[PDB]
Amino acid sequence: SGFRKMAFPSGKVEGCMVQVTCGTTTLNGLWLDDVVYCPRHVICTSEDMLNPNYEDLLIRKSNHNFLVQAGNVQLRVIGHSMQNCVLKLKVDTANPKTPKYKFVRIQPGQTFSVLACYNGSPSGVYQCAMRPNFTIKGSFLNGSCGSVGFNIDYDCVSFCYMHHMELPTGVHAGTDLEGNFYGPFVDRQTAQAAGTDTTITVNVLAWLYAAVINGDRWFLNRFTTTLNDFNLVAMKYNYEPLTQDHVDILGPLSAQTGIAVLDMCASLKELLQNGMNGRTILGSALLEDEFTPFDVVRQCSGVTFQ
Amino acid sequence: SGFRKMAFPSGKVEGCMVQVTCGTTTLNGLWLDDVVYCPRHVICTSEDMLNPNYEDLLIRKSNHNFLVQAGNVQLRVIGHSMQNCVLKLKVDTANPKTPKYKFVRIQPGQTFSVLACYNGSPSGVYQCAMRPNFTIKGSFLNGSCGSVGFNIDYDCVSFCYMHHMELPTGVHAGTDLEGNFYGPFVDRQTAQAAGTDTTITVNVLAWLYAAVINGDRWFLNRFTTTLNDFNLVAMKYNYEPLTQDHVDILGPLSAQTGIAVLDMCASLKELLQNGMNGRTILGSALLEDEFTPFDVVRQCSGVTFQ
Numbered sequence A, B: 001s002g003f004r005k006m007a008f009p010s011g012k013v014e015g016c017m018v019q020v021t022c023g024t025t026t027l028n029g030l031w032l033d034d035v036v037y038c039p040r041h042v043i044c045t046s047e048d049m050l051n052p053n054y055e056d057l058l059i060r061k062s063n064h065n066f067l068v069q070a071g072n073v074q075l076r077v078i079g080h081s082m083q084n085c086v087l088k089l090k091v092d093t094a095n096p097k098t099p100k101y102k103f104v105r106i107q108p109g110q111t112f113s114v115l116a117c118y119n120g121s122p123s124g125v126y127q128c129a130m131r132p133n134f135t136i137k138g139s140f141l142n143g144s145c146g147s148v149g150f151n152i153d154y155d156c157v158s159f160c161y162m163h164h165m166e167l168p169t170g171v172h173a174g175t176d177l178e179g180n181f182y183g184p185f186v187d188r189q190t191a192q193a194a195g196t197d198t199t200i201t202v203n204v205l206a207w208l209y210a211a212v213i214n215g216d217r218w219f220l221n222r223f224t225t226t227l228n229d230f231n232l233v234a235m236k237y238n239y240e241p242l243t244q245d246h247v248d249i250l251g252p253l254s255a256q257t258g259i260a261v262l263d264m265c266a267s268l269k270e271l272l273q274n275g276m277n278g279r280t281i282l283g284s285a286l287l288e289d290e291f292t293p294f295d296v297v298r299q300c301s302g303v304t305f306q
């Protein structure tokens, strides 16, 4: 019992983290097989980072301009290439600690684990989600660029995120591991706004299901609602619409608890219109939307990874 | 910027987790050097678990009754011993991945990271606190017993918690790595109650400082307060008293933000009396008390560990 923002265990990723240095710019990189992936703005100077031309800065570079270093043992660069916003640095030695891995692009509403790193060394691990506006609400200081986000599937690390920048509201933007940004953001220091964010409805229902599996029931009601009449309330409250696919993913949670998905929508509806009245749900005074149905099942059935 | 429940990277502890089996009881253990640490109730049978006589049960056991396995290789047990509620299984092989470590007893209010494990395999990592009533609000299913909590200091792991049991309210109890429970709980399945919990005042103030460092200022005011008049209010709201050692530890955070500790106390005082009016602080509609001053500094200056 209990429920927490649980991250995947981070050991497999820790063994991949390295430090990439170009000029006076130092960020974190990811070393898989004989490639180190990092953000391309490592080749920028603090006076190039306004309107850089990356192809143009890169062609003026040699393999020996990249000090890549794993712990204390450094790494000889023997090739380099740009893939969108990511640099791929071929080094002369394959990472022994390389896990079974893959690169994937996730959608808004999915969650993943972040290993925040500084100078190639892990600092901490936390969970979060791809917001519907393709920001993530992370915790990132200067030099965290190059930190990755990931999910674990038994033995297989699925890298989905690399960190590039903070936005002015204080949220974060980045790319997948093929270098394409999530959202309309670019790797320069200019005026970019996050865009309007919405609450991930399917996740809020799943966390209401986690509440019931853990004994919280004060928010249930006899009430039901149609899918259409619920979406009417949800749009009023800036919640993303609920589709039949969402209803279907919540099946297992509906059947484990005996509470029909549309009944739980009637509960969510009544919580939006009334608030909470000082009650909490799973130690929160807010409706949480950064738990997927998968997260809930995992943290309510004991799914491990090795 | 940003602020989240950040856990220590868990790789050093993952390399230590193993499966211990006695009879049909399987739980997790900690293999450090040639010793495997687990909860002693592994030697119980599901009919022993009401009023066990642990030493009586342990003298009826041989080394070969203990199936200890690290991945697929098993470890031969070549000695056994009881240290309070922890069983010490001496194995014929020293763990190669044994990090620098130590065993520490933590105080209420301090935090640590939990690596929830099942059958020796890490499932997830999360941050929490020793409540003032010596419970922890974990996320723990059947078979999570033997999971450890820890802090990291540069290279050294500090083991402070081994998981033993869930209480009826759904919170969790356990021991340090020398086997002594935190709190008045015993490793048997009888009527045990958590006791009344208080809020960790010093941590709430540290999280208020985290909010200021991250741009949340709305709850500040011109008011100030004496230490005594603040305590008069916090005790009314079931908050733990504020001492000068608390004031002292919040020194750096005070100085870095420019806000005296007693000014921030006055701000907390008003938050207790008025609530939040739907406002939020660091994404939370509650006053958060599972962040110590050290946690805030770490996350707000990017301390790393290697």
Ligand SMILES: *CC(=O)N(CCC(N)=O)NC(=O)[C@H](CC(C)C)NC(=O)OCc1ccccc1
Binding pocket: A027, A041, A044, A049, A140, A141, A142, A143, A144, A145, A146, A164, A165, A166, A167, A172, A187, A188, A189, B001
């Ligand atoms: C490289 C790095 O660590 N970044 C992460 C910064 C934070 N706080 O998340 N990214 C940048 O420093 C980035 C460099 C550009 C893309 C060449 N710039 C950026 O994010 O702009 C705003 C900013 C920068 C640093 C700290 C706060 C905000």
Ligand SMILES: *CC(=O)N(CCC(N)=O)NC(=O)[C@H](CC(C)C)NC(=O)OCc1ccccc1
Binding pocket: A001, B027, B041, B044, B049, B140, B141, B142, B143, B144, B145, B146, B163, B164, B165, B166, B167, B172, B186, B187, B188, B189
């Ligand atoms: C080791 C283990 O699996 N336990 C953790 C169980 C949870 N959910 O924390 N501990 C026990 O099963 C424990 C065994 C006793 C101490 C010999 N019993 C216990 O915690 O009592 C209530 C309970 C048991 C299992 C699941 C929920 C609650």
